[PDB]
Amino acid sequence: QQAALRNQQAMAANLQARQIVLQQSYPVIQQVETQTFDPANRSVFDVTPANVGIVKGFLVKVTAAIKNNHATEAVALTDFGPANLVQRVIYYDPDNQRHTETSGWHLHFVNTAKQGAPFLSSMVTDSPIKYGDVMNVIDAPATIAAGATGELTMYYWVPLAYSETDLTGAVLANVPQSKQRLKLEFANNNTAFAAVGANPLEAIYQGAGAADCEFEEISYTVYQSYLDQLPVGQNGYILPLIDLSTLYNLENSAQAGLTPNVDFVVQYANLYRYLSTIAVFDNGGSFNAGTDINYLSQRTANFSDTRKLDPKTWAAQTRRRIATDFPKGVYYCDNRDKPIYTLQYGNVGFVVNPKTVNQNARLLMGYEYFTSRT
Amino acid sequence: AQVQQLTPAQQAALRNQQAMAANLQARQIVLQQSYPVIQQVETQTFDPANRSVFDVTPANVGIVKGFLVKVTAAIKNNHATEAVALTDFGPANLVQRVIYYDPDNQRHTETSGWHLHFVNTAKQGAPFLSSMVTDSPIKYGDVMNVIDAPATIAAGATGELTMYYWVPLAYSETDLTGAVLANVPQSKQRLKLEFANNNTAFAAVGANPLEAIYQGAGAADCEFEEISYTVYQSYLDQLPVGQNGYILPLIDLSTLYNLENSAQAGLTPNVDFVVQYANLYRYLSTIAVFDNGGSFNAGTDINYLSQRTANFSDTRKLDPKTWAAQTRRRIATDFPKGVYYCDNRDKPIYTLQYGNVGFVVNPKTVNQNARLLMGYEYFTSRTELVNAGTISTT
Amino acid sequence: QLTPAQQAALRNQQAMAANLQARQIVLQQSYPVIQQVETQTFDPANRSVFDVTPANVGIVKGFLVKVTAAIKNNHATEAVALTDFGPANLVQRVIYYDPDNQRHTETSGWHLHFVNTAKQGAPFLSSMVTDSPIKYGDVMNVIDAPATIAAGATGELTMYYWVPLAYSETDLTGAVLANVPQSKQRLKLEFANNNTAFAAVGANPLEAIYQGAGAADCEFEEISYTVYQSYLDQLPVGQNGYILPLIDLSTLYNLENSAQAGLTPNVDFVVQYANLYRYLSTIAVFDNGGSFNAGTDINYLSQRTANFSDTRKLDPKTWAAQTRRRIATDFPKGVYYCDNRDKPIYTLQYGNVGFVVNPKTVNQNARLLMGYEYFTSRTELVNAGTIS
Amino acid sequence: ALRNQQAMAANLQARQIVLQQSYPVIQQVETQTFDPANRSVFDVTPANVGIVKGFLVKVTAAIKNNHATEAVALTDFGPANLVQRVIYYDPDNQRHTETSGWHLHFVNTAKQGAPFLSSMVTDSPIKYGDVMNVIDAPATIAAGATGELTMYYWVPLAYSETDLTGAVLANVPQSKQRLKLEFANNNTAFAAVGANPLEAIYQGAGAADCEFEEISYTVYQSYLDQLPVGQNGYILPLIDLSTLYNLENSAQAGLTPNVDFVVQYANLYRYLSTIAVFDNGGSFNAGTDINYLSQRTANFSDTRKLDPKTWAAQTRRRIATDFPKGVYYCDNRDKPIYTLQYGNVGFVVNPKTVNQNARLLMGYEYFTSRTELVNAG
Amino acid sequence: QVASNWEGPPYMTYNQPQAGSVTLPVAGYISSQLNNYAESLNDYLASQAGV
């Protein structure tokens, strides 16, 4: 085909211009907004970023001051913990196009998956020099007793570009009538404290004293990382054109209808090129470490499976990617070496065959993918 | 030539340059148009008091990259008052040997389970399939227990082991050297697996805990119950058929990526004990275990370790702490007590005479039955791989 | 053509292309050799400053310095404890000099350790704690020090230092050519003695190793050091002689440190990047009068440019969040790292760059200890058109 | 071929011009006194002058015995264990000699024909003899006494004073030659009762309190300045200078009684001599633990299969005395052992009694050619 | 011996998509191409028969 030579010559001119921008421009990170509020009044806020350069991500710092007003009982931290401080993040392009519409716990897990380690954590070493947990970048107390007050902090990286060396998905925000936007929803007093026997999925603390837990404050700070001082030529800006035409998105969903020993297939959308998959088997307010799933797979259109593995062998594949295990009930599927395009090789789906299904059991599906108009 | 015997520009002149330009062109065609598949091929639960050696027949599909071997074991103690404790190699001694024969009946990898575990550690950059401890309040860590074993089996208690082995055929996911083509109606291809008995997996107090799993006073009564295992084949599907059949990297599928191991004896204190690297291999890593007569020490019985060459005598010659400091850069920890690792991946040893490059241990106290347990990892090539035949049904 | 500004830009583009070509010929054809150059055991009560002569062989890439020590607490009842810098204060100063009297590194002990950490992505030569039942972990004690030396006890210390000449194992920038006949190279090493390594309760534990109520009776017994030289041999030879990267060997990869004083609460305190270097990293240590705090005495750390514009201006907890993205842990209490390796700070591109700290609390005798890491080359400075 | 007889005839003509026109210089390189409880290894960097022929290393020591009552006595290797290990490096960083100290001393004995730098006892009434104490050590050191040791080493580069094969041309634009020297220390030079006296100097019941007070060394450099210049440059022997004369030591173990233990000559060199030291578990015996020694070719033909008293009879023909107990010399200077595929000639020792940790310490000298065969382009 | 329609052995290449081939078209699309449809069937059968 003669049309596969121009679309490879357009990639060669694009990659020539990507290494001009990354080598001859300035990486800036500056604070765009900060605000402290009470979540009883409002918890959904909109952040107007700066319209300059090539934006390649946002760093969101969220703090909290949870107080337990119970008489005698305490609460304990959930498994997702301080990652449920932001309930949702939505990003809008300067042309008002939605890029990322994931939740908070899914944004933390892709931050874990893109690093190879738990995000912004300090690993325990044998060193006698006092490294380790010094500054408390991500921090939350394990229990909050009756009458106590716990201070929380949590960091989110909202990505636009794929990495620091790969400017795919980045946003050129030097446009005149820019509609660039970053929505943020936060945990109020109804979604962060679950009672015993409830679903601790979107909660932060859970225990016998959650009926009188409340926030005192939530403060947020947004920092925008971008590239300033772009190379200007005679014909104008020198830019990686089909790198800024591509989006890099993060979505989440919720599927239901699980039956014991029956395969449950979630289809991949034909227009996206999927890079990763995160499935959370929420078994009716209960989370289990693989002891309620027969297998997980990635089945193609005919019936052919590509990775049909036991839940312990599925976890063995993620341990050579992020060097630990995700929390119990969370399952990760990596496709970065070969993305699931499901337009050039059939209709691929994602299969979970459960062993035990409780009432109101659902399957939350986080996605990460590229998108263009090819 | 000043340091190496063959100086990589003039060891590239010993290879066909027109045949490796066509070989790299065929590898990137294969990796572009194929799909990574991992399938379960064989599962069996057995009692090792009856049978312990198993031939596993892998599927005749695609270009095979490697095997993932999951071994699960249950161990009863059956002593009155005494307990046993886990050894240093521990659950990695669940597989005593692993042999692979290709579709051309050519032996690829023949080693023990402890040496297969350490090459799996050394190629990752971390202990194999382990979870690090962090400060994060989000509950990461040991949730699924991929590799897991109890540390102490008490008097009248049952322990459950789990261990994973990656049996490599291809070198990496990108370098397809050592991979085999198995897309054939039949082949002479098998995977031999020796497992731990009740004799070799429990050692008494005083005996050599090298191939053992648990060691203690109550080890005479320790029994296995079940050693269920599972084999997963990892291959590339949907090969790019061009004209005259499969487009194949011919030099890559004719090279073997082998993992042999050995045992050298004859050490005396305060002199050099040289282990010769063999001829016409391309060595990538060396692992030495200083079995000092059933005792394993953390460097305190070695003067120095070294890699020696015929001309240009010592290329590295370090203290046992300085040798371990070069290892802490690569795998972000150090190997168990008595294990020493040497990396040769950027400059592989390929030396065209027999004893031209050697590995040196200079010990300082040597017991009676002291030996070095070498484990190698190398490329070799004895065959050529001309193009194949088709059917054309009448 | 014909203008000396663009005539020099053309031959700098050709010299840079021939340098990157000659570099990967060297890194393909050479062989890495590491050999010992000196070992000595001494007493710090007599002498504690040593000078080491490395061998003039090949292309030298750097030095690995093992330092072992023994410390006795001769107090009757009181014990001591480690400081936050700990065994990295076994060496007080590392100075290296070229065979042409060009100073390469003048770190302290702690600053050389932190650059070794930041170039690895982990604490230098440490072992991660994992869940594996196979006995990995801390077996050999490559970097080791007891947390407490009791009254009457003895503690063995071990510490390693990579003194870098070349930048990395794939970038030969800053390496010293030594296969030609020339003067000898010089590696000076000042060690900790019985005056600088033990601090009383209340003294400034910046360059100490142990601190406690029994530090007046603590003393060294021995300090051993071993120096290993890491270099490349069997260099490739072309038709015109040796094939060498000619502007990588004539560039200096350097590791100065410094200090400044005069900090006022809630007033921006600027430390300017003075010379025409290409700065790669920056370590700020806020010695708040002997006290070291975890960001609670700093309002913000920042980096300014010529038109007073902050190119990063973060909270101390957000400054530490960018540190955890690189080395997967936090630097010790009071140490602030700034990575600039993708775009090095160069005060000829966008004007004069400074480093800003706005302190919240300031104690007496407070200072800001800096550590730089940069490139240095020879600046060509052609005339463009008019002279007047 | 005639291209190897003509090129060798131009090498021998150019060697006779160098040996007749040059002048031998011996000059001091470096002297240093040290405490072995502080430093033990020293690297000496001589200048690059002329055609280097070798190095003279004078080692002086002082051993104090701080034991209360018991004394120590000399071992059989004696003051030759002062230098433990000596390495020379080329201007081009090419190793030449990488042997130990006792092996360097015995090759100095074998090249002379007598114990090296010794004085023979004569009947003369004129007072010759041990006047200057060139190589000297006390026999015992009593409890509370101090002994002075002196020992000379010749590190060879050229083969002999009339054969320039092996010599280094240090008029090259590369770099400076190096001479690394490991000396004895307080953990090597004193062996207890029943320990291995192989690399010790003194041995006895008071060795736990024997300490070095000082070791001093001096390095001299023998070279040929005043080199002749022809119509095209330096007249040089191109084969003699592009040839290494090396000294190397090894160690083999794994012996069992009445079985031929074979040490194969690896390493396609031209072996000139062999020294085998039968260390039978810390015990050195005068031939009473060996059945025979031989040099068989390919498990095929013994060429000098002799019992240990006839083997020593061929040594007394050569060095006019015997090497110490356990030391066995094999001379091949007239017809050098030149294996040509790997595994062609071996060295055999058939033991009679083998103790624990019994080994066989080999020491070779040989000629070899190097790489970068350009011959002064 | 070369053939203008030979794509390799026909039992191995009949269901194989081509090299770039993100989405394949159909070989014909009265309503659309007609003699291009008939020559796309003759070219396929000439591949399965080898001239």
Coordinates of N, CA and C in Angstrom, one line a residue, chain B residues 1 266-272 279 304 310-314 317 354 366 368, chain D residues 85 93-95 98 199 248 251 253 267-269 342 356-359 361 371:
Chain B
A1 N 43.6 -6.0 20.3 CA 43.3 -6.7 21.5 C 44.3 -6.3 22.7
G266 N 38.3 -28.6 44.9 CA 39.7 -28.5 44.9 C 40.2 -27.1 45.4
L267 N 39.6 -26.6 46.5 CA 40.0 -25.3 47.0 C 40.9 -25.5 48.2
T268 N 42.0 -24.7 48.3 CA 42.9 -24.6 49.4 C 43.1 -23.2 49.9
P269 N 43.3 -23.0 51.2 CA 43.3 -21.6 51.7 C 44.4 -20.7 51.2
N270 N 44.1 -19.4 50.9 CA 45.0 -18.3 50.6 C 45.7 -18.5 49.3
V271 N 45.2 -19.2 48.3 CA 45.7 -19.3 47.0 C 44.5 -19.1 46.0
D272 N 44.8 -18.8 44.8 CA 43.8 -18.6 43.8 C 43.2 -19.9 43.3
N279 N 35.2 -22.6 26.1 CA 35.5 -22.1 24.7 C 34.2 -21.9 23.9
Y304 N 39.5 -12.3 48.3 CA 39.0 -11.5 47.2 C 38.3 -12.4 46.1
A310 N 44.0 -14.1 30.4 CA 45.3 -14.6 30.1 C 46.4 -13.5 29.9
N311 N 46.2 -12.7 28.9 CA 46.9 -11.4 28.9 C 45.9 -10.4 29.6
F312 N 46.5 -9.3 30.1 CA 45.8 -8.4 31.0 C 45.1 -9.1 32.2
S313 N 45.9 -9.5 33.2 CA 45.6 -10.5 34.2 C 44.2 -10.2 34.9
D314 N 44.1 -9.2 35.7 CA 42.9 -9.0 36.5 C 42.1 -7.9 35.9
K317 N 39.0 -7.1 40.6 CA 39.6 -7.9 41.7 C 39.2 -7.1 43.0
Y354 N 40.4 -22.1 25.3 CA 39.7 -22.6 26.5 C 39.9 -21.8 27.7
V366 N 39.0 -22.9 54.6 CA 38.4 -23.9 53.7 C 38.1 -25.2 54.6
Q368 N 36.3 -29.2 54.9 CA 36.6 -30.5 54.3 C 36.0 -30.6 52.9
Chain D
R85 N 54.1 -10.4 46.6 CA 53.5 -10.3 45.3 C 54.1 -9.1 44.6
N93 N 50.2 -0.5 29.5 CA 49.4 -1.2 30.6 C 49.3 -2.6 30.3
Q94 N 50.4 -3.2 29.8 CA 50.5 -4.7 29.6 C 51.2 -5.3 30.7
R95 N 50.6 -6.3 31.4 CA 51.3 -7.0 32.5 C 52.4 -7.8 31.9
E98 N 53.8 -11.5 37.0 CA 52.8 -11.4 38.0 C 52.9 -12.6 39.0
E199 N 54.2 -19.0 53.2 CA 54.5 -17.6 52.9 C 54.8 -16.8 54.2
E248 N 55.0 -16.3 36.2 CA 53.7 -16.5 36.6 C 53.6 -17.7 37.6
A251 N 48.4 -22.6 41.3 CA 48.1 -23.5 42.4 C 47.1 -24.5 41.9
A253 N 45.1 -28.4 43.2 CA 44.9 -29.3 44.3 C 44.1 -30.5 43.8
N267 N 47.9 -22.6 27.7 CA 48.5 -21.2 27.4 C 49.6 -21.2 26.5
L268 N 49.4 -21.1 25.2 CA 50.4 -21.5 24.1 C 51.6 -20.6 24.2
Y269 N 52.4 -20.8 25.2 CA 53.6 -20.1 25.5 C 54.8 -21.0 25.2
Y342 N 45.7 -26.8 22.5 CA 45.5 -26.7 23.9 C 45.4 -28.2 24.5
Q356 N 45.4 -33.5 54.4 CA 44.3 -32.5 54.2 C 44.9 -31.2 53.7
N357 N 44.2 -30.6 52.8 CA 44.6 -29.3 52.1 C 46.0 -29.4 51.4
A358 N 46.3 -30.6 50.8 CA 47.5 -30.7 50.1 C 47.3 -30.2 48.7
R359 N 48.3 -29.4 48.3 CA 48.2 -28.7 47.0 C 49.6 -28.8 46.3
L361 N 52.0 -26.1 44.1 CA 52.2 -24.7 43.7 C 53.1 -24.6 42.5
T371 N 49.9 -8.9 21.3 CA 49.1 -8.4 20.2 C 49.8 -7.1 19.7

